[PDB]
Design a protein around this nucleic acid. Sequence first.
RNA 1: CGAUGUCGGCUCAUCACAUCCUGGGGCUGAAGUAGGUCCCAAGGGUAUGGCUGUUCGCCAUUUAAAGUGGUACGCGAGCUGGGUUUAGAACGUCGUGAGACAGUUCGGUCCCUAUCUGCCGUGGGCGCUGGAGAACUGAGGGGGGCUGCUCCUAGUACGAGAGGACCGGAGUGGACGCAUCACUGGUGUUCGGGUUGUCAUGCCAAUGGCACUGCCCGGUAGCUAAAUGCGGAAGAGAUAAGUGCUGAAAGCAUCUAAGCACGAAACUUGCCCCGAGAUGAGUUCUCCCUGACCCUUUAAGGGUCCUGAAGGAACGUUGAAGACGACGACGUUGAUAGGCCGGGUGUGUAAGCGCAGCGAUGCGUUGAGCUAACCGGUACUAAUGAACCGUGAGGCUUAACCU
RNA 2: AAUUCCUUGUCGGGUAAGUUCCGACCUGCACGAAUGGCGUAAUGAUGGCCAGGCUGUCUCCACCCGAGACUCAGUGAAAU
RNA 3: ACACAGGUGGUCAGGUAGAGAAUACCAAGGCGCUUGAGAGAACUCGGGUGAAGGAACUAGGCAAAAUGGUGCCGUAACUUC
RNA 4: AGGACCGAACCGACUAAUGUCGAAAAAUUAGCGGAUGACUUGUGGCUGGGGGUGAAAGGCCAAUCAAACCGGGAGAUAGCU
Lengths: 114, 62, 14, 120, 56, 122, 209
Amino acid sequence: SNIIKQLEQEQMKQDVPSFRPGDTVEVKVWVVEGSKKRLQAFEGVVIAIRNRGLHSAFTVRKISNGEGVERVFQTHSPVVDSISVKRRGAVRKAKLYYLRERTGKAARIKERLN
Amino acid sequence: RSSGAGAQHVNTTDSAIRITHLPTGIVVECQDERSQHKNKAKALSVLGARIHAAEMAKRQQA
Amino acid sequence: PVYIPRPRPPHPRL
Amino acid sequence: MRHRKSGRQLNRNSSHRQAMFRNMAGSLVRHEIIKTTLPKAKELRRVVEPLITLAKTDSVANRRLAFARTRDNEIVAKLFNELGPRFASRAGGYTRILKCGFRAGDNAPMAYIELVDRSE
Amino acid sequence: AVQQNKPTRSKRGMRRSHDALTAVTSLSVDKTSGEKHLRHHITADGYYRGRKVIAK
Amino acid sequence: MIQEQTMLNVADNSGARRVMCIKVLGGSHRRYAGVGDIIKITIKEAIPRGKVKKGDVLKAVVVRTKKGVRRPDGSVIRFDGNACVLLNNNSEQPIGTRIFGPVTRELRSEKFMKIISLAPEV
Amino acid sequence: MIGLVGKKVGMTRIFTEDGVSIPVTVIEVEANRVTQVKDLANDGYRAIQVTTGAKKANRVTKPEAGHFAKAGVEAGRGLWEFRLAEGEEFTVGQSISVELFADVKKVDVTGTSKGKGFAGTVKRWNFRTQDATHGNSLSHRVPGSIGQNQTPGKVFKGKKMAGQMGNERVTVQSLDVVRVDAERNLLLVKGAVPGATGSDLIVKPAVKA
RNA sequence: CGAUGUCGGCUCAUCACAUCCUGGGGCUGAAGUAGGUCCCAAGGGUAUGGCUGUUCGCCAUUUAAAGUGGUACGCGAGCUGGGUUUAGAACGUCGUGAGACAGUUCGGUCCCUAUCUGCCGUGGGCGCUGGAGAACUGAGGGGGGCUGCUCCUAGUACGAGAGGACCGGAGUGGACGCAUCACUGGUGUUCGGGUUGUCAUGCCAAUGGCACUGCCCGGUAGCUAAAUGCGGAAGAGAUAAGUGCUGAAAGCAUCUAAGCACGAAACUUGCCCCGAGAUGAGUUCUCCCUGACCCUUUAAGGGUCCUGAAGGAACGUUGAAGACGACGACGUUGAUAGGCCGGGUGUGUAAGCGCAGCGAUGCGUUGAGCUAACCGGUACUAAUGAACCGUGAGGCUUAACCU
RNA sequence: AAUUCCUUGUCGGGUAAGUUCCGACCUGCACGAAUGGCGUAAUGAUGGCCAGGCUGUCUCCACCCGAGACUCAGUGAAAU
RNA sequence: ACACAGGUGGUCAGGUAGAGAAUACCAAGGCGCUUGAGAGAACUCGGGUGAAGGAACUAGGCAAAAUGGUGCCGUAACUUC
RNA sequence: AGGACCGAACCGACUAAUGUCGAAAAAUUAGCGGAUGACUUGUGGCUGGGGGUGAAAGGCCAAUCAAACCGGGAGAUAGCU
């Protein structure tokens, strides 16, 4: 409908950086620690992108200290602040759910460098 | 109701009595015959024998 | 009919 | 409860259903008018119209995508040469349904499904 | 499944009271030929809305 | 989602390795726990140098879930393995002096201060 | 006060500045003009019946056309009626906009539920499905026992069994208001409301104040 | 005894209070908390695992609680068959023996397509009387009514200290039920891609058929929760237990005999739903019908011509409505269904061509191609002009009103 | 113990918790040496228990594909 | 007892892949199994998948799920070797 | 060489489901055990009813077995319905 599209397009931000799934994407997200407002960092590998317009989201899989940490992020949410692509991954599949079982040497992928 | 076998009797039944004596903690289990009363008398005789044995054992230890 | 079968056993109830 | 679903099952599995839609679409392209039941014609409206839509523009790869369906060279030969430049002006809706009584074998709703043709 | 007793002729009639078929009684007249046909159906000779739609 | 008969890894260095969740504590007829709820566990495997032995039945707190915990912005945080921190049954006060792996922000409430104080990430 | 008739057009979410994203439903509100004001002198109760939308001038019948020409307003789809609360009085033909929702904080939405059809016992009354193995024959999703024995000799009235699910007139109560838009003629409500996209919704003020 | 299937288990429950908790109170050998006992109150809730076929019991851990019983110790034309009681075989005992053992253990086919009442729903005819389209009021009936933890009050009262209130308010939880895909998932054999074995298109390439959708990987819309909100109330009337005021019988005393004011999740409302078949058939608005005659048992009678009115019905397009009926939208004065254009989403650099490499293969055109059930438009196709049912203003009596 | 009534006799192990199981204690109602006893490699659609993987068995079911069940056309029963 | 998903001895017997008369697709050859058309409700059967747990379900790992082939390394208690 | 191992034809039915007025008065589906011998099967004979036969269940003896079927004593008898 035009009503739903008009209500969504007035809220979507117009400075979304375009990135393919597989890129080493570092996202800085706001967090409220009570009386503090800190911009924290989260650097990992994007394994899924669900485009839904305003409802769009993207996963950033990170291998932290110990086991892996998978965390989704809404694109047009005010809680996130910056999205910076570090490396350009050259996978040929939209979803990268097979990387969950792979740890260590088998987790890395190809660089585009086109 | 009782465990074991051979009759419906068993099924509609009860015919199994457990009596616990509270200040000592003595449990007497009787599943012998078909009737409760003839097991009631056996359960009270076993209660009397076990209480008398537990008291005389404490007296002989003292 | 020429052949009437044996009926179906019943509940045990023995 | 099939809320907002499409696609008629027609009491057949997807293999036989796709195969008979293939054969019936080929027969409708070859003969330009056929007589069948009514829901088969209703679903064949969703089969023949994408074939003509693919047959709107003649090229190299469009012949291979029109050969991927209907599995025949004479059907794709009648496509892109005879139906293509004749249905060029009209945009969509190239078919026509005619309800024609009932069949005497099983009392099913009969229908002539045809194209907008036969002015030869 | 197995009944206690049989129903009546009256019970059978009150059951078959809703089994009465309904005729359409709405046969149309063609514009050109005037033959009898049903709603949204072609005639025996293929007439529909005056135009020869079957061409056969 | 931590329910009965669930095997969990131990987050701190208290000594146990594999534990089994036997009951989700808090509220009757409860299916599964949440972000930082108290569960009751038994110990199935431990190290020789642990402060607790194999077979001790004690209370623990879930810190990482494979089902995922939901921040109120609309996002979810899914971990690649279930994890718990062992607690001493009347006052929580966790046994391990070092804790491996990150925790969730909703655990930080008035009683788990030592866990998020020893947390290396988040 | 009175409630208003609106149309459900999808669901969205509102991102607040602090971080919490609230799921909202977009209820559009057209000009709910008054068709008739019923008084106690002829009915014994004071109320107003209104309409919404806009019909074409081929579908509306001559009784409905005369009933609409009695008020003189434009023909719209449906008719609803709201009881008055003794503190106000409306005239015939007053265009009631969404501005009555600017003061209230919580609303109650009544809508036609989405029809699930002839559903079973497990889907309707949330019964536990029996064990699908260990000798189970022909008794997977059946309700099982529906009555006791000879001494009742019947099934009790009100028994939770399989049947019609959906197409009801259910009411999700105590829904928070989010934004009252007058230019787009919208009414964002918090949470989910009964009905699909395009169904009628009676949005009344909260009786549980 | 010309047949009533019994135990235990799973699902589904119903009712009584001799009440397990929640609620209102009295006594206490009740300083507070935590208690013991008793009364009223059935509105709601009333465990999870090991053993045993076991009901029961013990243990471990919760809970506010792990209530007692009836309903053929509820429920096998709802389900197993572990145990008890068919046919085989053994251990111990008795009997010379065949055989027997409420002494076990091993294993052993549990039928039925619903005629009637009942229940869950959903329809047709007729009625309410001139008919129809709607809108409701509302008799009556149904759904729900559980509460933990933390904080303020407040470390306050109480208490030598330790410990620790009543009442009131707020937040966050568990279960239940309802609603919906806005988020996260599952399915998505109608969408895309990778690949194995074979066959076909005369062959390469490419594609299709089969082998459980071949194996899988995701994934559009719908359905679904594990996902997200909502609610149990606040308030009023009449009360049970109980606490009372005035107050004689009976100079006192007395909650009662006259009366009055309190007093619970129990009763009726108040929250929501069905509902005028409530044959007691309700109320309001609107639309439509104002043409002649004979026969006569001059009866609320029958028959003929002309007209068919509002409206309904039939057919088609169909639906987040639906077993079938029924309900909703539309029928050319059109956006109801199918098709088409664009966008969105999903799979992921189609085919062909060109270049590098002996080759598999890699790169550019290209983040292309294909898109189902989605959105916004577009009559391109199909919903034809019409025929069918339903009528000439509507009975008797009485009163008030205008003539 | 295929033996055992009392009995779920007693100790230890396995499990958080084990009337089952294992190794014993002998108080053998009513084991016992060819109507054979005690062990025994391998074997068994054998009885029981435990450990790992694995999963809709379950927690708690949800969706989809075909065959019926629903409707129409034709033929058309049965128990009672 | 039927134009019945049962049983009936011997001979010939190919292409690809395969250890193989197994199994997958085909040649020669025979057939589509004497009720169809709709809609895609509850319920029943054969199945497929599934977030998190992995037997907590049940008398009982019953049923389902899982392993599965060739070459090589290595293989414990006990034993009649 | 093996009353050897896995696994087709073949033999039999151990579990669960479908049926249970069934496709059929014992079957089918998905898993099974043996499958070079104490194996299976065709053809033709022999053993028979107080008997035959039995790797032994009191099983089988033409869908009927702790004494088959057919015909006759016999219209047995029945204090029983």
